[PDB]
Amino acid sequence: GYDRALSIFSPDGHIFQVEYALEAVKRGTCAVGVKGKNCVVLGCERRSTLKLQDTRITPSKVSKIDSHVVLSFSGLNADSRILIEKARVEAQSHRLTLEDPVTVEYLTRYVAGVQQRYTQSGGVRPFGVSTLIAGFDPRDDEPKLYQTEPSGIYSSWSAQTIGRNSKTVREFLEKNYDRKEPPATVEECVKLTVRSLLEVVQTGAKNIEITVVKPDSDIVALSSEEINQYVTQIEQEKQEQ
Amino acid sequence: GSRRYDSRTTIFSPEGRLYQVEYALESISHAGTAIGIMASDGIVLAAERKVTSTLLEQDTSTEKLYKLNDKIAVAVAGLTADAEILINTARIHAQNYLKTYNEDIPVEILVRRLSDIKQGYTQHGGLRPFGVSFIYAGYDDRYGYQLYTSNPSGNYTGWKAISVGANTSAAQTLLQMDYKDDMKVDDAIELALKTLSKTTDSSALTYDRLEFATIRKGANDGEVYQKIFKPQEIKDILVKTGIT
Amino acid sequence: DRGVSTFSPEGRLFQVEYSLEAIKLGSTAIGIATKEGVVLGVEKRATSPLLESDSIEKIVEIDRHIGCAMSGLTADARSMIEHARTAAVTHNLYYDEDINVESLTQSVCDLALRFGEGASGEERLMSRPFGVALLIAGHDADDGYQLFHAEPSGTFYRYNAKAIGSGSEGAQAELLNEWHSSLTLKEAELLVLKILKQVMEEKLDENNAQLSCITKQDGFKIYDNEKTAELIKELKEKEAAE
Amino acid sequence: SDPSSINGGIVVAMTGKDCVAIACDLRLGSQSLGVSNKFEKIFHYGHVFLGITGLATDVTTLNEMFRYKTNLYKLKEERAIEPETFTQLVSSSLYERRFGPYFVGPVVAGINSKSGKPFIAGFDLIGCIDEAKDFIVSGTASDQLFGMCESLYEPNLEPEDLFETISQALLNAADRDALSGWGAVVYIIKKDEVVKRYLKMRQD
Amino acid sequence: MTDRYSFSLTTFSPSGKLGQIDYALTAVKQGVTSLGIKATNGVVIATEKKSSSPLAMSETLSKVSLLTPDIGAVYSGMGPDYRVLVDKSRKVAHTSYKRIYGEYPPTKLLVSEVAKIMQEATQSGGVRPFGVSLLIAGHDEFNGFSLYQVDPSGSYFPWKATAIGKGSVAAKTFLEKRWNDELELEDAIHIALLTLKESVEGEFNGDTIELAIIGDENPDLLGYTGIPTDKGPRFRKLTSQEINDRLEAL
Amino acid sequence: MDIILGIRVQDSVILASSKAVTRGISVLKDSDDKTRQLSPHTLMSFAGEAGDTVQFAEYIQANIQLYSIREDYELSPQAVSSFVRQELAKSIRSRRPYQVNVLIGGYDKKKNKPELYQIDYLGTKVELPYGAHGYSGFYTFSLLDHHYRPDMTTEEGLDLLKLCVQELEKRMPMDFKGVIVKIVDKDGIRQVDDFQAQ
Amino acid sequence: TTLAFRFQGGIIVAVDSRATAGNWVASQTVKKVIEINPFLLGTMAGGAADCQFWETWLGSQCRLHELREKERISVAAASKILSNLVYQYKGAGLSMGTMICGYTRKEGPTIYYVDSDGTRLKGDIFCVGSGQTFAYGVLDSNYKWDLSVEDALYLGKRSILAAAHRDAYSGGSVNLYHVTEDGWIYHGNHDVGELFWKVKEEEGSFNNVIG
Amino acid sequence: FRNNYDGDTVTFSPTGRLFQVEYALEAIKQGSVTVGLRSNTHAVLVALKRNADELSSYQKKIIKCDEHMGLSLAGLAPDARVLSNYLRQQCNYSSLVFNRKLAVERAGHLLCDKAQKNTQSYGGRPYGVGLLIIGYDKSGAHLLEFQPSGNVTELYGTAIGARSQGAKTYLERTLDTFIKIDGNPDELIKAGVEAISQSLRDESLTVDNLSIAIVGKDTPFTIYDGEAVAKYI
Numbered sequence A: 001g002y003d004r005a006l007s008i009f010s011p012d013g014h015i016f017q018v019e020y021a022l023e024a025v026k027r028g029t030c031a032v033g034v035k036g037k038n039c040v041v042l043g044c045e046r047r048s049t050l051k052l053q054d055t056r057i058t059p060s061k062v063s064k065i066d067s068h069v070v071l072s073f074s075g076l077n078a079d080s081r082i083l084i085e086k087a088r089v090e091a092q093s094h095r096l097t098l099e100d101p102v103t104v105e106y107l108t109r110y111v112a113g114v115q116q117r118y119t120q121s122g123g124v125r126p127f128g129v130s131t132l133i134a135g136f137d138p139r140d141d142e143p144k145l146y147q148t149e150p151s152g153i154y155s156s157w158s159a160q161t162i163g164r165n166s167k168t169v170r171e172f173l174e175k176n177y178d179r180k181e182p183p184a185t186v187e188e189c190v191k192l193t194v195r196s197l198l199e200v201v202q203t204g205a206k207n208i209e210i211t212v213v214k215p216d217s218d219i220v221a222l223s224s225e226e227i228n229q230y231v232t233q234i235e236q237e238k239q240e241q
Numbered sequence B: 001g002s003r004r005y006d007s008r009t010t011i012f013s014p015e016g017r018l019y020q021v022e023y024a025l026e027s028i029s030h031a032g033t034a035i036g037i038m039a040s041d042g043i044v045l046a047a048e049r050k051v052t053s054t055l056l057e058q059d060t061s062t063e064k065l066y067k068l069n070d071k072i073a074v075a076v077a078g079l080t081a082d083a084e085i086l087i088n089t090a091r092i093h094a095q096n097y098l099k100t101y102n103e104d105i106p107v108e109i110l111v112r113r114l115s116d117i118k119q120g121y122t123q124h125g126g127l128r129p130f131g132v133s134f135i136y137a138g139y140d141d142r143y144g145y146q147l148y149t150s151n152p153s154g155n156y157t158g159w160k161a162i163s164v165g166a167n168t169s170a171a172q173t174l175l176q177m178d179y180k181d182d183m184k185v186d187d188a189i190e191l192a193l194k195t196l197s198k199t200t201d202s203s204a205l206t207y208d209r210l211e212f213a214t215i216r217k218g219a220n221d222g223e224v225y226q227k228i229f230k231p232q233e234i235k236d237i238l239v240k241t242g243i244t
Numbered sequence C: 001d002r003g004v005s006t007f008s009p010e011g012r013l014f015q016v017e018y019s020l021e022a023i024k025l026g027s028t029a030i031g032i033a034t035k036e037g038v039v040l041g042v043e044k045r046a047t048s049p050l051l052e053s054d055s056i057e058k059i060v061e062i063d064r065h066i067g068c069a070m071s072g073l074t075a076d077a078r079s080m081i082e083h084a085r086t087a088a089v090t091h092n093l094y095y096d097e098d099i100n101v102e103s104l105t106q107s108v109c110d111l112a113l114r115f116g117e118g119a120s121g122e123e124r125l126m127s128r129p130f131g132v133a134l135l136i137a138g139h140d141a142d143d144g145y146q147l148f149h150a151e152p153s154g155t156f157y158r159y160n161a162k163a164i165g166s167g168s169e170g171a172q173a174e175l176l177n178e179w180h181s182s183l184t185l186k187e188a189e190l191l192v193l194k195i196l197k198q199v200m201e202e203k204l205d206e207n208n209a210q211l212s213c214i215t216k217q218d219g220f221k222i223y224d225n226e227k228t229a230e231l232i233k234e235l236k237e238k239e240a241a242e
Numbered sequence D: 001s002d003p004s005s006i007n008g009g010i011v012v013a014m015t016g017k018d019c020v021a022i023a024c025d026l027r028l029g030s031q032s033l034g035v036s037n038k039f040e041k042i043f044h045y046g047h048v049f050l051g052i053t054g055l056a057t058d059v060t061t062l063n064e065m066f067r068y069k070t071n072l073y074k075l076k077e078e079r080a081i082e083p084e085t086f087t088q089l090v091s092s093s094l095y096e097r098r099f100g101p102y103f104v105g106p107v108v109a110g111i112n113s114k115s116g117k118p119f120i121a122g123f124d125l126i127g128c129i130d131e132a133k134d135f136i137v138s139g140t141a142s143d144q145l146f147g148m149c150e151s152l153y154e155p156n157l158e159p160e161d162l163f164e165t166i167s168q169a170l171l172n173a174a175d176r177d178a179l180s181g182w183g184a185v186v187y188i189i190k191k192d193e194v195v196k197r198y199l200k201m202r203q204d
Numbered sequence E: 001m002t003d004r005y006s007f008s009l010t011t012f013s014p015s016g017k018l019g020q021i022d023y024a025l026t027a028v029k030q031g032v033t034s035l036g037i038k039a040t041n042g043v044v045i046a047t048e049k050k051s052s053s054p055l056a057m058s059e060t061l062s063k064v065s066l067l068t069p070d071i072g073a074v075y076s077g078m079g080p081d082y083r084v085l086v087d088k089s090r091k092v093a094h095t096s097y098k099r100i101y102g103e104y105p106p107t108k109l110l111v112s113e114v115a116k117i118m119q120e121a122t123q124s125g126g127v128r129p130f131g132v133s134l135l136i137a138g139h140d141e142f143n144g145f146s147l148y149q150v151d152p153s154g155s156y157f158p159w160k161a162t163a164i165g166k167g168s169v170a171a172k173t174f175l176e177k178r179w180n181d182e183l184e185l186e187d188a189i190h191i192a193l194l195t196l197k198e199s200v201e202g203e204f205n206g207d208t209i210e211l212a213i214i215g216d217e218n219p220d221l222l223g224y225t226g227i228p229t230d231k232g233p234r235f236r237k238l239t240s241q242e243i244n245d246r247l248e249a250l
Numbered sequence F: 001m002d003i004i005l006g007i008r009v010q011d012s013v014i015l016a017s018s019k020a021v022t023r024g025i026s027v028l029k030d031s032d033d034k035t036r037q038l039s040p041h042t043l044m045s046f047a048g049e050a051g052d053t054v055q056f057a058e059y060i061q062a063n064i065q066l067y068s069i070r071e072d073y074e075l076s077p078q079a080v081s082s083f084v085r086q087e088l089a090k091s092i093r094s095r096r097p098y099q100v101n102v103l104i105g106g107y108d109k110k111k112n113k114p115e116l117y118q119i120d121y122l123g124t125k126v127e128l129p130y131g132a133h134g135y136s137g138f139y140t141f142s143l144l145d146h147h148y149r150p151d152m153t154t155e156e157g158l159d160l161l162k163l164c165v166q167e168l169e170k171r172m173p174m175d176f177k178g179v180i181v182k183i184v185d186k187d188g189i190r191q192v193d194d195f196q197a198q
Numbered sequence G: 001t002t003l004a005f006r007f008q009g010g011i012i013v014a015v016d017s018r019a020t021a022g023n024w025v026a027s028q029t030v031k032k033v034i035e036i037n038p039f040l041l042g043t044m045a046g047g048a049a050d051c052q053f054w055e056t057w058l059g060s061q062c063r064l065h066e067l068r069e070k071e072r073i074s075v076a077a078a079s080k081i082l083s084n085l086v087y088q089y090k091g092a093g094l095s096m097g098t099m100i101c102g103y104t105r106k107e108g109p110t111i112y113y114v115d116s117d118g119t120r121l122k123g124d125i126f127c128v129g130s131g132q133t134f135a136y137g138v139l140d141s142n143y144k145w146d147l148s149v150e151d152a153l154y155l156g157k158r159s160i161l162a163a164a165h166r167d168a169y170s171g172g173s174v175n176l177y178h179v180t181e182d183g184w185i186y187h188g189n190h191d192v193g194e195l196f197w198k199v200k201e202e203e204g205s206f207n208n209v210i211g
Numbered sequence H: 001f002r003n004n005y006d007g008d009t010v011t012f013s014p015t016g017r018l019f020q021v022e023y024a025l026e027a028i029k030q031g032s033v034t035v036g037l038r039s040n041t042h043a044v045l046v047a048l049k050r051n052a053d054e055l056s057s058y059q060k061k062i063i064k065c066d067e068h069m070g071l072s073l074a075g076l077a078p079d080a081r082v083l084s085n086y087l088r089q090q091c092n093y094s095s096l097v098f099n100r101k102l103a104v105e106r107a108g109h110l111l112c113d114k115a116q117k118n119t120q121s122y123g124g125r126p127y128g129v130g131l132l133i134i135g136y137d138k139s140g141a142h143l144l145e146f147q148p149s150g151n152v153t154e155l156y157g158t159a160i161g162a163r164s165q166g167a168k169t170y171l172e173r174t175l176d177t178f179i180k181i182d183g184n185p186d187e188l189i190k191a192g193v194e195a196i197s198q199s200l201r202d203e204s205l206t207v208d209n210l211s212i213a214i215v216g217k218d219t220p221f222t223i224y225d226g227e228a229v230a231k232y233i
């Protein structure tokens, strides 16, 4: 029944509900993705307003869509679950009918198409969610990184960040990422991600996760200590000066 | 037409918040306090009955602690009637999972589905959210003892100890103070009561204003038991912890 | 507020007028029709230098003899392009021939006014108009080479040349003078690049500006970055001459 | 063709002095070919037992279904469903698929926890209740079971005597039916404890 | 045409109140006083037959209603809301229970079903909440006698004794003094007639008072004989005559 | 019908499945793999009506693969079998039922035990030490009734199949073009590539 | 009578040109090959309408894949659209036996048999139609992987002629195709009318006929 | 006043008016001028087409509905597409079912009833276009004026759009002259051109600017554009 137009044009040509959806994304905990020569890395900050959690069962910020593609997000957590489930079903659907896993562009283009639809359908508000989608095409070694926003617009990024204080960490990456020589190693790619988060997180051992995605469905999340090492080396880079 | 009278319950503020969610959270902050504490050898649920009389039958009374499964329970904070609608569809999902796979539902799976239902009332349909927050205490053979929390926004998180409803700020500080990871169920019960005892908006904490549940794995069996404590059994455990 | 399909006292549909405003905030797009082909150019307009520019697809193929450039809320264009492609292929299936450029445009414009809250007509289930204009360009045996402007109002004009987006009223005044009936394809290429350079914020290079054409012989071809770079260098030397 | 004669199998139930028994064979066949010698036909929901003969897929599906329904029953009512009530649930559940029925012959058996009264009942495939005091029979050798039960059975048998009488009824009936046997199990049911026994029977 | 009211008319306010549910409780407060008392061997529900006009036949208006042969309801608030709730309550006792398990639902569950319908009117598109509170008194084999209160929100609670409507605050205070866990049914009919005398302004007799009990089975009210298991309904409305006999010993 | 054999030994389940695909009077293919991997330790073999056979297999596969990513966890063989049985038991009362019979062989990494489920197109499921579908069972069940032991090694298991396939090559009227043999154990699924003369 | 086989030099595709209405010969001048794109061929056997309509509809769906994904459709994915379509009409009485034959860089030369029963099979050698057995006879007893293009073309032609001769419901003429890295090449229309006598003389075969 | 009663078409004003309908009527006056007039034998449509730029086409104002009927538009072109499309179907349904050319009079009644439904139901909007319908049926030459209020009127001649009152005052005067141009199509068109040129001001009607249509006794509804109309400038 309920088909009230919630996303409409205002006199200055603006869709305020799509505008206000972006504001919910600004409020979201920060997330970043930097693609190396042979890898892509997703880094996501953890809040510190309430700490007595179970870190074994609390839903972590990077989701697997298929075995070769992953999706981090900033914005409303509950909204992000609905996009992830839809993307995970399109992954299996695509294999079933094409006999081949989705490309990263295809999976992105689908998620972008869903966000768009919820900006001109009666009875529904836009998703309060931007996504980073990263991975490798089947039998391909060229790394991929894509961004979607509530409007439904998408595009690829050498590196990018979304959420609270993304302004600051984009400035960092814009003067610390050389397109001529992308982080040649997995190690030095993870280093530039942690460095970029440490501009915003303010001393965060148990406030920074990293996930590393390599070709041929090779995805691994780093433990506290592994990240805790990269923090200890980066703070000795500053002090030695 | 009708447009004149439409509140528009599923819209964003200029700041990017969901009016009806925020206000529902406000509703839940005035409800009786509910506490979950997870130990090594079990989980405690405690909750405080908002408003009572000499004449309110406490024996045939359940307003805050409901069994969803034989391995999963919830403590409620908010509108009782709204909770019963969600508890009833949660009990059905658990049976649809048991019928389909011939295995009991993993706790996170049930919690995600209930959180997904709430999330819907937040993005489409034009109806008010459910003014309800749940503490889920459950066991399965993948993650063992699990304590989750869900709210009108459709968002869920896992916990070692957590509170919902009234005086959560005050309660969370007192748990963060005296919780340790090596804790035992009997320690947890004692912690759960102490906390309520100091966040209560009432004179004393008596047996007739309390509901209590434990999910233990009785060492003389090898299987998981749910105990929803009877009035006399809350009255016992109240004298032992030295609150008489 | 009030109805989404409501008339202003001046006899105009609010939501459609407000829609044309969104389209003025979009990146520029230019079209020029000649007897040797039709040329489509766009301003890419990346928001950051970390954005891989050639992931910006603001010129799409509809069929081999039809392509279109967009401007405004480009996400709204996806379902329009889907409808254009399905229509062109579905015409080919039913008549064993190529759909006319004009008829293709008429089919896209038939979506535009399908918005409302249950407007007494058919079943227009779409909350608002589209926030994007299209320059549909193509060739057919009947009416030769053709450029069309497709607004969210549902109207569509044929132009000899047309600009849409932020730079349009400036660019249009320039096309008015420069266009004649006996331009070559090469002339129209330099002319698009020239007018983009004028009305773009950034300095025009082969990364933030994309060319394309449609010729009877070769169909619809997006120009790769090397070919466009040589045409920017050619422009600069002709401007430096006099 | 006849969905009642593809897999084969039997169930019987008998009442005694403050006890009931329900027994079944273990055969699961596909026409002449025996396939499984472990297929049990007697389930329990609390203290109420249900045997189901007929098309084996439906036997499986109804057990899953009455587990589902009795589970939600216990959550809402905060007590275990009683035999008399479970009978009606089975009846109404079967009648609900009147024009596409489950090809089964169900049999309820148990003791009322409040009255101590032993109770049995059986049903046709669209849920007509048959509530005899004495005994209930079902499956491919029903005829045989009818003649064994009618001849062997007397009222007020003690559990240990009842066990002999239901065992001799089932065994001697299954050895005259091509689609039954391959082993059997007997449940003796009293107010407090319940004893399950596997019988030694001809393996042909 | 077509219900285009597909959106909630009850929404959270910035203070976290539900506007329409509070306003419904206000409408229930203006209502006439009605009460309930649970004895050891029965339950009594009672209210005043506030006759709108003396030309009106007060008998033809059942404020107290049989839901199942062992359950009864009474109300404070808007009588039209009650009348359709009793109609839906009797029919849900059949479709969601008696047509499945072949016995009448227990009190708590039927109450649960009433509560659910009242909650849906709190949340469903294009409706207001019901402007009543219900007091439901019943018996079932496994829970014995019970008494429940149901509010416009859908919330319900069990009571030993309580009142709703106009003089509830004072009626509740008077029941606290006089209630014990040893009361016989007669003792509770007496306390109910006392508590209801404080609420009534004008005449107080059998023709202004509507009072029913859940108690012993009434074989004489069954309609047929020859089935021993069937002993007849526990619900019995008291006659105009029966109330007056007990008023002369007040 | 086609040949669908399964046998559970000490520490593995072995599925053996005929390579022939025959429309009418012509053997179209002689190398058909009548099996889909559902999860890394659960395998499903299938025979039945021309189209339905693979359509059903690939549909189940997609659903199990979906469940795996969503929960980042592998369903027990018991859980997969119960899902598959229920899907068939719906299909049987639908407008056009899937006419497909399946064996599910899986290794339960929680119980550290192999499991073999046989399920017909009606939704009839049973756990067996050894199983078969179509006419094949008329020979193999009495054979295995004799030569089977529950404590057999995977190597013995394979000799017990070589004995079943020879018996079928002797006495059955169809040329089924030999079998493809797959082992499901603690280490996942591998294809015995040399069964052509083992 | 249609066949497709895979060898060293790509794929050979050969089809008869006869349409029947029972024992009435409707045509001897029919196309049984759909050229879907420069690298994709579909063969037609069965109901004339059913084959023509749905293989034309496949042609559209393949073109729609190129516009959407800016990539030539895989043989696997092309065969599977037709396969999945046909499977929705199962029981309704569609009748088609078809080979989807094509080259992609990713797959190499690939053949899919797809039939109206739902059956979808990859393979090196298929023969489809009332004439299939006659064609298999010649093809299966001369096939090597290592044939020259010239010899493989001939074997394909000679295998349709074979079935044109024996099968009352095949004939007219042989259409020949070769599928390489560079796409399909058409190797002409050969009227069985003149082909039979040229082959019988040159080959010394068909000794059963008086000539 | 007006501000509170012009939200939607389901709301009357206190004086008894429907503003959404009047606003829709307003879109017509902003539209380019078009003329209609008829004798006893032929019926003409002369429309002035309007171009956005000198680089743009002069948007098509005349649509053919059957061999014997068509119409000129002024206002929203997309609304003239939906209404002309509905007329094409009704002319088509009349031919296929009854083997009968749809009467111009009955085409009028059907447009009227389609426009009216949008003016009495919430969520809808009035059509934002005026149409002049010419036909030659069994009762001879006809001209109709359609208004989005749902009012349709059979006339000898009329005009709608911007400055339409000039052409309308001229036809009101020329009535006894042009009505008697029977069996002379070239003279009825001339008196149509001389009518529309009474409502010019900006420019003079050129070759790719003017649009003419004719229907009558032995003349199928045929549209003259460009070079074809050069002999009337």
Ligand SMILES: *C(=O)[C@H]1NC[C@@](C)(O)[C@](O)([C@H](CC2CCCCC2)NC(=O)[C@H](Cc2ccc(OC)cc2)NC(=O)[C@H](CCO)NC(=O)CN2CCOCC2)O[C@@H]1C
Binding pocket: G001, G002, G016, G018, G019, G020, G021, G026, G030, G031, G032, G044, G045, G046, G047, G048, G049, G051, G052, G095, G128, G129, G130, G131, G132, G169, G170
């Ligand atoms: C090699 O094996 C060839 N054998 C010859 C032939 C004719 O049997 C056929 O299968 C051929 C397939 C080609 C024909 C040319 C167009 C591309 C497809 N089939 C026919 O020619 C077909 C026979 C046929 C009829 C009916 C059915 O079952 C419905 C199956 C096959 N002929 C027709 O369909 C005729 C066309 C000319 O009249 N029409 C009808 O049969 C009309 N009825 C069809 C069924 O529905 C009712 C109307 O080629 C193979 C490759």
Ligand SMILES: [Mg+2]
Binding pocket: D174, D175, D176, D177, D178, D179, D180, D181, D182, D204
């Ligand atoms: Mg036997």
Ligand SMILES: [Mg+2]
Binding pocket: D203, D204
């Ligand atoms: Mg035997």
Ligand SMILES: [Mg+2]
Binding pocket: G163, G164, G165, G166, G167, G168, G169, G170, G171
């Ligand atoms: Mg022949």
